[model samples]
Target: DAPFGTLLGYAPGGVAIYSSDYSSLDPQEYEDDAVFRSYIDDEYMGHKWQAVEFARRFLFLNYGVVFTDVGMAWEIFSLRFLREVVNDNILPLQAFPNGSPRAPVAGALLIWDKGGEFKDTGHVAIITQLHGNKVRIAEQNVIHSPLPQGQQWTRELEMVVENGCYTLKDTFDDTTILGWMIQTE
Candidate 1:
């Protein structure tokens, strides 16, 4: 397993993703909460390299917006707005259920519910690329191993459209995808 904090790869927008392998984390370092906190120019991103942290960082770096701090990634699905850091303007953030009429798009946030592989904290990822039958996402804490050469996204989820509704299915059968969130209006 890769040591904690190893640079796995770069996501879109050149955001550096680090290894989140808790097994390799030093016990002494884990005791210090400050070691995990991440920031960008005084704006507080989430913990160092977790899925939620990556999601927030990606949005902040690429869109100049961020959602409020959430205790767990699943809570993001309930959020209704994103704060524009530059002007303090609040933009509408809409949640679309996995099979909602509003299809998932690039730059959206894909959220998984707390269960099975994800457990109590749930999970969140940035949708980097979308295709007719699949969507590619970038995230941390899910795949601890090194990503392939110059790969931007960590995984791809199959997307199926039916009756004007779009649905994304996770590769892990045990985990449930709550939905996707998009900043609109």
Candidate 2:
């Protein structure tokens, strides 16, 4: 595995993603607490190279908005607002449970429940592309290997639309997608 902090690839909106391969992390190098914290200028993102960090950074870089910090990725599902970094304007965020009538869209946040493959902290990814049968996402920590050259997304999840409700199935059979969150207003 590439050591932790290796440049994996860029996500949509030209946001950078790094390797979160904890197995290759050197404890001595990360002994300082500050090393684990990620920030963009004065705003805090999250833990370095973590899924939460990537999601927050993606939103901040692309939309100039960011959500409140949460202890776990799954906790983001409950958040209902995003703060505009420049003006501190609060935007309403809406959550649509998996299979909801509301279809997922690009720039939405996909959330996973804590279980199976994502045992403890759950997972979060930024939806980069939305299609009829699938949605492409960008995130860190899940794929430790380097992405192919110029690849903007990390993985794709199959989507099924029936009677207007959309459902997303994860590539990992063991993980469960809780839903998606979108900044609406």
Clashes of 1: 0
User: TM-scores, in order shown?
Assistant: 0.94, 0.94
Candidate 1, poorest ten consecutive residues by summed lDDT = 24-33
lDDT of each: 0.90, 0.91
How would you encode candidate 1's per-residue C-alpha lDDT over 1-185 as one tens digit per residue? 57778888989999888898877567678747797888999899988778888999999999999999999999999999999999999999999999999988889999999998999989999999989999999999888788899899999999999999999999898898999999875
lDDT of 2: 0.91
- The list of candidate 1 runs beyond 4 A from truth reads 26-32
Error of 1 at 148 (Å): 1.3
Tens-digit lDDT string for candidate 2 (16-50): 88988777557666645787889889799988888
Residue 25, candidate 1: alpha-carbon lDDT = 60
**CA error at residue 21 for candidate 1, angstroms:** 0.7
